Amino acid sequence: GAMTGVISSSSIGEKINEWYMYIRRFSIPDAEYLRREIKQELDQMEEDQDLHLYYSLMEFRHNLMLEYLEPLEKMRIEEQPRLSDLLLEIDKKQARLTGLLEYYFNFFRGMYELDQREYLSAIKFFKKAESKLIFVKDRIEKAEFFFKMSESYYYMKQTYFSMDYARQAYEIYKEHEAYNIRLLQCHSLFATNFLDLKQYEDAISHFQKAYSMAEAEKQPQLMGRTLYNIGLCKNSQSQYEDAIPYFKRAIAVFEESNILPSLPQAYFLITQIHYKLGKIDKAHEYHSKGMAYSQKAGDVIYLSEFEFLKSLYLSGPDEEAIQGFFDFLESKMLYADLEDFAIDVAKYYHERKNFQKASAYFLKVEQVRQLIQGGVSLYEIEV
Amino acid sequence: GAMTGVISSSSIGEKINEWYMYIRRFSIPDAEYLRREIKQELDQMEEDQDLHLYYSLMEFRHNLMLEYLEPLEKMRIEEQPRLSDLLLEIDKKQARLTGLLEYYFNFFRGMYELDQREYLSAIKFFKKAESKLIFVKDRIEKAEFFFKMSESYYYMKQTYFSMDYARQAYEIYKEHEAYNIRLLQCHSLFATNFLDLKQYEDAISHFQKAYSMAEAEKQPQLMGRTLYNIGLCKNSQSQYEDAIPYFKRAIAVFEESNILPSLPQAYFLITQIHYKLGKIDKAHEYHSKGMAYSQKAGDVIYLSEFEFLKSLYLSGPDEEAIQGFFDFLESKMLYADLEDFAIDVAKYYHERKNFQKASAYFLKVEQVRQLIQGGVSLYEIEV
Ligand SMILES: OC[C@H]1O[C@@](CO)(O[C@H]2O[C@H](CO)[C@@H](O)[C@H](O)[C@H]2O)[C@@H](O)[C@@H]1O
Ligand SMILES: OC[C@H]1O[C@@](CO)(O[C@H]2O[C@H](CO)[C@@H](O)[C@H](O)[C@H]2O)[C@@H](O)[C@@H]1O
């Protein structure tokens, strides 16, 4: 599907949330342990500054925990206030810090729930985080929220909300300067959602706009992703001849800049396209390179998918290797890839008048669509 | 698809919107006009009183316009205020009322936009409405909002958000006493959403729960819909025999209460099931009754869908009448019906080992899936 992509650490945010839970309970050894463990981790990482802003605040909240406990040392246990009453006091006198921590807590707890594929739960925490945006005074930090809500709702395919949030983030980024990289990213969010709605031309316009902006910013990871995504739009519309140039330009960018993570996917559709077109000559060359990149990075999913291309276009087809591939994708919950591929096989046969085979794979497409793919649980509701 | 609702016109709420436009324009003849005419459309209404409440606050707003304009007939052009100024005076003195008016205004404007298939715009207005909820007094009216949001996002297939709003509505209705009908309707919402997610067991559980409660409230319209929908779930899963008693029970309920407008749908899938089973005698039975109900209710769509059952299972298939039927659904934008039926045709030919023709209708499905069925437009975003 579309190149998005990359950089979760739902791990760390949720660790800071747990640290906060230990802080509110005055679980001192546990709070000290996490205070140390998380620092070490965040130290090997110019990645989110999300996490960094949050860490600082909890650092300060940890120190206030210790300040409020210092008096208790000059006290008989019977004189000392209950810890629940100590906590009520901290929160009273730091209404503002409390609400900003409550913002991040829900935010990162939602991100974690999302990684756990607990969607309704994730939305619940995301809405509670949105309620605490009043505690987020900085406008760019508000826009970051909206931006990551757009990504999140893109992953959940709540297309309309993903675009509404991208438009909220856009409004803010646009009125500052060089938030231009975030702005072009808003463009790819519009584009990727347009694509899911089958609005290919509008997706292409936003991908082109985003490309132009990435070139001006000299952001080659982004230049290549948008190039790739425009070829994808063309490919989905069976406009094979227009797809190829974008796929080639995307490959060149990634390579010239040594972007290894992106290269197995960058090589994949272009390889499929040549098999489809009967240009076996040029297919085998693309198949080998992308095959070689997948080996280097140990891309399990792309190794398996390049092997699929040989099972269909070269090897019979090997219906047996195809079924096991489908079981593999299914077991990995790669349901979109699976449906597309099951169509590819149906279409392969259809075009060769093996209507009985085409048809069995069209029935397989149906069997995948009937699977619970993004299922949900009600929180505390009794039937 | 799943039965639900009753409606609506999305027209009276928009008329009160228009009414308030002239109020803010101080255009008294036009204000006066709609005040009378909306008054007259309301008292002849099976009212959800969104509207009446909205009307009443607007009637007061209309008098505050006639009242603010009193001192004006005592003045000549030069003495009198700018009507821009007069409006800001009225807004600043009536903070609470004005916000409560914005609540309703945005809510009914979003409904109208949804009705115009302007989805992102409908969400933009719905969020404005949600944000004036602070001006909304009472918790049952908050619950009404959430419940209606859940209905709207169900219609927009933003399934997770639809379930999140149903849950928020549920929580309020649950702690209240005489809101059992609302509560069972929340269960139908979880159920219809679970269905879209392929969680059939969860959907049945919640449909069964809402049936149970609808029985207790002696609410036959609800009893029939929930029974039909359980049948629908069995039908979706190809559990055809299991489906029949459910549809029979539903039809018994709709007939007992002369629920004429539900009978065409009620009869539809049970007819199709009998064809599917090769029970042409029973099939011909349900088909004549379902078709007669469609003729009497003036149901244009079912009249045409019963015709298609003839075309497919009796007439050849009559491929040509099937093509004109598909075009008809496509033109009315009935895409879910269209895809299901195209699959029904594929499977019928498949079972008869006409794999070429099966394979051609499997390709129709894929074409229908490629249409822009829910396209969107960005508000004011360049290139
Ligand atoms: O590579 C991980 C990362 O890439 C994305 C696109 O940005 O998905 C691609 O790679 C997957 C294999 O890991 C493919 O299955 C998929 O078809 C392709 O789009 C992201 O979805 C993923 O996080
Ligand atoms: O009666 C219109 C109303 O019924 C619903 C289900 O509650 O849809 C049914 O009727 C449609 C044709 O009018 C069918 O195409 C559809 O398959 C069927 O569920 C509502 O969706 C619709 O607004």
Numbering used by the authors:
A (entry chain A), B (entry chain B): -1 to 381
Describing publication, verbatim:
In Bacillus, the Rap protein family modulates complex signaling processes mediated by two-component systems, such as competence, sporulation, or biofilm formation, by inhibiting the RR components involved in these pathways. The second subgroup, comprising RapC, RapF, RapG, RapH, and RapK, blocks the action of the target RR by a direct interaction with their DNA binding domain, and works as an anti-activator. For Rap proteins, regulatory peptides are called Phr and their mature active form is a penta- or hexa-peptide generated from a ∼40 amino-acid precursor by means of a post-transcriptional export-import process. As previously disclosed by the crystal RapF structure in complex with the DNA-binding domain of its RR target ComA, RapF was an all-helical protein consisting of two domains: a small N-terminal 3-helix bundle domain (residues 1–68) and a large C-terminal TPR domain (residues 98–370), both connected by a linker region (69–97).
In order to determine the molecular basis of RapF inhibition by Phr peptides, the X-ray structures of RapF alone and in complex with its inhibitory pentapeptide PhrF (QRGMI) were determined. The crystal asymmetric unit showed two molecules in the free RapF structure and one RapF molecule bound to one PhrF peptide in the structure of the complex. The structural models for the free and PhrF complex forms were refined to a final resolution of 2.25 and 3.1 Å, respectively. A comparison of the free RapF and the RapF-ComA structure reveals that binding of ComA to RapF only promoted slight local conformational changes in RapF, which were mainly restricted to the RR recognition domain (the 3-helix bundle plus the linker region; 1–97) in order to bind the DNA binding helix of ComA. The core TPR domains remained at the same position (root mean square = 0.66 Å for the superimposition of residues 98–380), which supports that RapF in solution presents an active conformation that is competent to bind ComA. When RapF was free or in complex with ComA, the 3-helix bundle domain was projected apart from the TPR domain, thus exposing the ComA binding surface. The RapF TPR domain folded in a large superhelix to generate a pseudo circular structure that was closed in a wide channel (8,588 Å3, calculated by the CASTp software) by the interaction of the terminal part of TPR7 (and the following C-terminal tail) with the initial part of TPR1. As a channel, the generated ring-like structure was open on both faces. Arg80 was located in a loop of the linker region, participated in the ComA binding and was exposed to the solvent in the RapF free from.
